[PDB]
A paper describes a structure:
Chitin is a long-chain polymer of β-(1,4)-linked N-acetylglucosamine (GlcNAc) and is synthesized by chitin synthase in the plasma membrane. In this report, we determined seven cryo-electron microscopy (cryo-EM) structures of S. cerevisiae Chs1 in the apo state and in complex with UDP-GlcNAc, UDP-GlcNAc+GlcNAc, UDP, UDP+GlcNAc, PolyB, and NikkoZ. The overall structure of Chs1 reveals a dimer architecture with a twofold symmetry and is ~100 Å tall and 110 Å wide. Each Chs1 monomer is composed of a large cytosolic soluble region and a transmembrane domain (TMD), with both the N-terminus and C-terminus in the cytosol.
Using AlphaFold2 predicted structure as initial model, we built the atomic model of Chs1 in apo state into the cryo-EM map at 2.6 Å resolution. Except for the N-terminal region and a few short loops, Chs1 is mostly ordered and well resolved. Except a short loop ranging from 245 to 271 residues, the first 374 residues of Chs1 are largely disordered and invisible in our cryo-EM maps. SDS-PAGE gel of purified Chs1-ΔSL showed the N-terminal region has been largely degradated during purification as processed by trypsin, indicating the N-terminal inhibitory region of Chs1-ΔSL is more sensitive to proteolysis. This finding is consistent with our cryo-EM map of Chs1 in apo state, which showed the segment 989-992 of swapping loop packs on segments 245-271 and 376-379 of NTR. Interestingly, we found that two phospholipid molecules fully filled this cavity and were sealed inside by EL3s. In the apo state, the path from the active site to the chitin transmembrane channel is blocked by the VLPGA loop, in which the proline ring of P675 is stabilized by packing with the indole ring of W760. In the apo state of Chs1, the putative active site is open for donor binding, whereas the putative chitin transporting channel is sealed by a switch loop in cytosolic side and TMH4 in exoplasmic side.
Numbering used by the authors:
A (entry chain A), B (entry chain B): 245 to 266, 375 to 401, 409 to 892, 908 to 969, 977 to 1015, 1025 to 1075, 1087 to 1125
Write the structure that this text describes.
């Protein structure tokens, strides 16, 4: 219940502004267009079952930059009550072209969370009128790019009416359209086809704020509007970022907000879950079960270990929250503009930080000067999303993730000295330095997976062929050729073609790699059993058993073990495709490159018409002299220069990746003519396999087991601390 | 001297059309715009030192398709005299954006040739008024793409005046602008900066015909306008194709026309020469001397051998001539449209023949049904052109040549049975079949050069390292790694980047390959000298000496030997770059892929304005119901489909090329795990080098010597027949 404000509709005959409830002449309010329309009586019929905010919707045409809304004298309904309304929590939802099911899921999760907070009993912050402290800001990116089933859902809530959007106002290009309403209707069911909207006494009001950008700038500009724009006016305590389609759990927003009672917390995130469908029906898809296992282990092992140190690298799908005072200043300046100091040319970090979009913020929050903000991971809050079910869209999704992670980790390692310019105490500074070193160690390991997988596969298959001879010779040669053909084809198709065009090939390549992994598992088991009936296979069995047991125990400690059997084998079988198809495509597509009027003739009936023709000899001579003159007096734009720089930097990364991996391959296996060279050196005074292969094979597995052990200790510490 | 016709200027007061020499009201002549403007008196001053064609210039706006000009009632000045003028020779010049120096060179060569023909004494065809039998048709491609220094040269000749070009006439888009004049001024000198134009009693008139297309369609459309368009009206005996910048020799057009006195000749071409500059100054550039040698040998060996059989594959720069009756019908239909029979989908040959643009015509002229046309090569006629002097533009030029040659040869081999459906006698049919088989043999050899060069280099360097041990071990390993790095980088940069962006790398790669070739030459000489002080190096010395001697003798027989010393070493040194840089880039770039208004606000002084607003409750309810309705009722265009097909077919060619070359590499050198496989097979019961390397090394050189011998016999037969 309860609202009020003073509207700006239009002027009548007396000239004193009049309300509809109580060709026309208007008046710009302070120089910019603000209009107040009533809503249809169909909504009023539910609403009655009445103050000013429920019955009007306010359109504003924002013609300025995000960082100038207040100066230009633009406002929001929250500031214009008799007592200005103070917001505790601003929830940002970003759409690009998402359909109404995804947006419906996000809004329904938000509405359920707000209802939970409003029904809270013993709280100083939340209570019966807690909905007044929450603003839901839906920033859609382009009118041309929005779906009409989303604008139809937004309209059905009461927060959109067409007709009074304007392209320009006093020769000023309108940059954005803002629709403001407070709705009493809630979403109660979202089937595969329909969204159930209903309004009764049990519903809670939601202060929606629909922003519609005029043209599609990317997501960083949406965040620019959210943080530099409306957050400056509303002054929220916490700013929460959600994507359309990410449905928060029933208490996730409250449980994340509860994380900020520690005054040192500057940001927080929760768990992101794969949405397995109805009765886990989607778990039959190997691509979906693999992703389910990957998400569960990224949350259980990686996030807890990072949160112990104090710096988290929030996962792309999960919804995050930042304390607004934490990000004001340097972090937002780095996030939106980049390293401002820059000459006409291009620098590596400054021109490439857009690849690591949100992971910059986190870094700058932790290493902020004279401030001891920490990032913290909340396991009590979760959000479930749908994952790609087809190989091409899976590849296209992970292209962004892998490039962002690689660049963010390189940037954080290269600039770690900032940890010591911040305001943390000495112990936290040491912990953060150790964590950044460990994260770069992980990045370095992930950079050499191309060689690691091939070396493990080739050593294993050749060793079994050497030892037992039966049909493993032919199998070794055949699998070498299959690997080579698939890898060459993946390189060529990712450098030149698009994944949508060739889907059968990518599916076939994934199947080939799965069969390869099955063969490697068989070889390992066979060699181990024969040895039990040498030392290297003792090491392989002990190390792999240990790394499986640590995963299982960490899942049990986290109290979420069911993914360790329903989804493990699928992930194991698709791991070679993660190494060999996702990484190649991600590295081959780093930057997403993209390389007078004369007159008219209209004739009359007779075929006649009139013309302006050079008739005087003098003007013909003039034109002739002007062309006789041209025969006597005898880098392009910034966009293509930036495109050239991006292409150079994308192609220098692939070459270095391939060469540095083949260096290790050639050192271990003595490829590259090295075995020839040693042979001919001795002749101056080739073997099948050396002891370098044994040493490397052991080292790889020990690294895997060590990483599992470190992450197990991290997760154990996380759970123990949280439980105490 | 001597012209006349009836002009179409405009209507005066009496209404009977009036001439300027003897806002106005006009009249479409037969429904289309034809205007006749006078020329400036500056030209008249030279001209006097007078009939109708010299003093007027005729603009026509062509709004129809090339194949419809006569039906739509468009004409040319040649048909409209009292006695219609019959053309013997139509010279087509195509520009895209060439500057005035290139066009000036072409026009000056043409003018000098016409002057030679007009001064001819004992000829039935040519005489004092021979200029009346020649029409020079300059087809420029796009108004936006033409240079202004070219339109200033064309205007200075009298064949262009601006002002009366029209975009549309009676709602018909004007497709092309035709300017017609007969000029008495000639070009007498073209320095680096100025073009010397002069008019006196020694000058010869030229019937120019400047076509200016409205928008840039590519060159095949220009030929479509020339052949299906103006050639249908003029009815020439011979149609000659020239590019802007190609300067014909002083008698080249007459000597090519002389080839057509044999009634069986359907086409002909002459020699194309590299323009070495002033006093051969450009011969200092290695890239230019290499091209000079390449052109001289392509003319001496390839063209004569082809001309003996009866089918030539005219070189891209050379100017060619077709007997018009020969190309009418099937050849032009295949050249312009492709295989007309085609479903909605894409077929290989039909959708890729545009890559082999002019080489289609030649094929269809020889294999025309019931006709015994032959193609013949004329050594008495030549044209000199400028060649690229920088590596990126050289690469970009050869991209087109290599793809065209490869596709044309594949097409000619696959469809050779048509030779037997033509009208030739049995012996010529056998000769043509043999020639097509030989040409496909050459194509097949050129497809495996990637493996041939590497195998020769690796066998040679490893053999010298094995035999003498001193520092050839290190050199072998170092050169293997240099080759690998350069090849991988070339693949990655040609698949992903543009040659303009990375010029230093391409120059460095060419230098690296030149040093590699120097090392290989040294190794061959060293091994041969040591053997003389085994049998394989006897074969190498005999075979390479024989293939050099045959080249030298063929150059002497042709009476053009000077390129065998001034330009030979440069070509030898750049040959690895031809194999390894031009071919990779050509194959990696086969197809040149390229992947509501709202309202406005203007306010008065008071800030007030008027609007159309939905005021009635009924219309707001209507809009709400129309959005509540959308929530209840719950492949792209041809261009991108063709782009996807082109990408698929371009990337399937690279993969097959690489795999089929590596198959040969792995068979000969036992790479690919094959030596491992044989070793472990024997263990079930690796060497440095095998005898396969010896056999392959001999075979490659014998093939080279055999090709030299065949081409020597061909050139000898050509010269002997011509001399008899
Ligand atoms: C060094 C590489 C530098 C690394 C740079 C970049 C890393 C690239 C990794 C390639 C792995 C090569 C492994 C290797 O040792 O090469 C082997 C094969 O010799 C070759 O065929 C070399 C081909 C060059 C590959 C360049 C990649 C370009 C992709 C398109 C490729 C187009 C296909 C090119 C061929 C038509 C070496 O042969 P060998 O040792 O002399 O034979 C002795 C065998 N024996 C002892 C049993 C008798
Ligand atoms: C078969 C190929 C199928 C052809 C398909 C396509 C043709 C490609 C030509 C490559 C030439 C390979 C030559 C070869 O035999 O491979 C050798 C190296 O083993 C490898 O490293 C294989 C790497 C795959 C190359 C695929 C090209 C992709 C370019 C990007 C590449 C990314 C870099 C990938 C590595 C990080 C084989 O090793 P080996 O014989 O087991 O060692 C024994 C040596 N010994 C006897 C002296 C002890």
């Amino acid at each position: 219940r309860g609202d009020d404000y003073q509207i700006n509709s239009y002027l009548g005959r007396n000239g004193e502004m009049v309300d509809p409830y109580d060709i026309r002449k208007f008046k710009l309010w302070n120089g910019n267009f603000v209009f107040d329309s009533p809503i249809s009586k169909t909504l009023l019929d539910q609403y009655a079952t009445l103050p000013n905010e429920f019955k009007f919707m306010r359109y504003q045409a924002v013609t300025c930059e995000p960082n100038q809304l207040a100066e230009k004298n633009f406002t929001v309904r929250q500031l214009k009550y008799l007592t200005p309304r103070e917001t505790e929590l601003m929830l940002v939802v970003t759409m690009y072209n998402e359909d109404h099911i995804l947006l419906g899921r996000t809004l329904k999760g938000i509405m359920d969370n707000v209802k939970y907070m409003v029904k809270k009993k013993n709280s100083s912050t939340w209570g019966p009128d807690a909905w007044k402290k929450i603003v839901v800001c839906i920033i859609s990116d382009g009118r041309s790019k929005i779906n009409e089933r989303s604008l139809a859902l937004l309209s059905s809530l009461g927060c959109y009416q067409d007709g009074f959007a304007k392209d320009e106002i006093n020769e000023k290009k309108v940059a954005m359209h803002v629709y403001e309403h407070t709705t009493m209707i809630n979403i109660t069911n979202i089937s595969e086809s329909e969204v159930s909207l209903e309004c009764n006494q049990g519903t809670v009001p939601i202060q929606l704020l629909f922003c519609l950008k005029e043209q599609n700038q990317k997501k960083i500009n949406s965040h620019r509007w959210a943080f530099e724009g409306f957050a400056e006016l509303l002054r929220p305590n916490i700013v929460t970022l959600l994507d359309a389609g990410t449905m928060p759990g029933k208490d996730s927003i409250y449980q994340l907000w509860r994380e900020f009672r520690n005054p040192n917390v500057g940001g927080a995130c929760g768990e992101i879950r794969t949405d397995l469908g109805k009765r886990f029906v989607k778990l039959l898809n190997p691509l979906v079960a693999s992703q389910n296992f990957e998400y569960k282990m990224s949350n259980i092992l990686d996030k807890t270990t990072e949160s112990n140190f104090g710096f988290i690298t929030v996962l792309p799908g999960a919804f995050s929250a930042y304390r607004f005072e934490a990000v004001r200043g340097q972090p937002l300046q780095k996030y939106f503009y980049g390293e401002i100091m820059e000459n006409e040319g291009f620098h590596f970090f400054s021109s490439n930080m857009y690849l690591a979009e949100d992971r910059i913020l986190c870094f700058e929050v932790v290493t902020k000067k004279n401030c001891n903000w920490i990032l913290k991971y909340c396991r009590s809050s979760y959000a479930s999303t749908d994952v790609p079910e087809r190989v091409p869209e899976f590849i296209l999704q992970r292209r962004r993730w892998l490039n962002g992670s690689f660049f963010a980790s390189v940037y954080s390692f290269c600039h770690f000295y900032r940890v010591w310019s911040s305001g943390h105490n000495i112990g936290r500074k040491l912990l953060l330095t150790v964590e950044f070193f460990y994260l770069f160690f992980n990045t370095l390991i992930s950079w050499f997976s191309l060689s690691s997988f091939f070396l493990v596969f080739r050593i294993l298959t050749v060793s079994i062929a050497l030892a037992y001879h039966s049909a493993f010779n032919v199998l070794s040669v055949i699998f070498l050729w299959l690997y080579g053909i698939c890898t060459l084809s993946t390189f060529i198709l990712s450098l030149g073609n698009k994944p949508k065009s060739t889907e059968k090939f990518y599916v076939l390549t994934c199947v080939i790699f799965a069969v390869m992994m099955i063969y490697m598992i068989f070889c390992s088991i066979f060699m181990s059993v024969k040895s039990f009936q040498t030392e290297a296979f003792r090491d392989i069995v002990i190390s792999l058993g240990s790394t499986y047991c640590l995963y299982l125990i960490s899942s049990i400690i986290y109290l979420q073990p069911w993914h360790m059997l329903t989804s493990f084998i699928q992930y194991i079988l698709l791991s070679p495709s993660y190494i060999n198809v996702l990484n190649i495509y991600a590295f081959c597509n780093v930057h997403d490159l993209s390389w007078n009027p004369l007159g008219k003739i209209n004739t009359t009936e007779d075929g006649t018409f009139k013309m302006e023709v050079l008739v005087s000899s003098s003007e013909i001579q003039a034109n002739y002299d002007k062309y006789l003159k041209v025969l006597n007096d005898f880098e392009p734009s910034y966009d293509e220069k930036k495109t050239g720089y991006y292409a150079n930097v994308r192609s220098l990364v692939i070459i270095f990746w391939v060469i540095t991996n083949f260096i290790i391959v050639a050192v271990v296996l003595e490829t590259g003519g090295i075995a020839d060279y040693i042979a001919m050196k001795s002749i101056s005074t080739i073997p099948l396999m050396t002891s370098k292969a044994s040493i490397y094979f052991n080292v790889i597995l020990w690294l895997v087991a060590l990483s599992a052990l470190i992450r197990f200790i991290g997760c154990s510490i996380y759970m123990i601390v949280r439980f105490f």
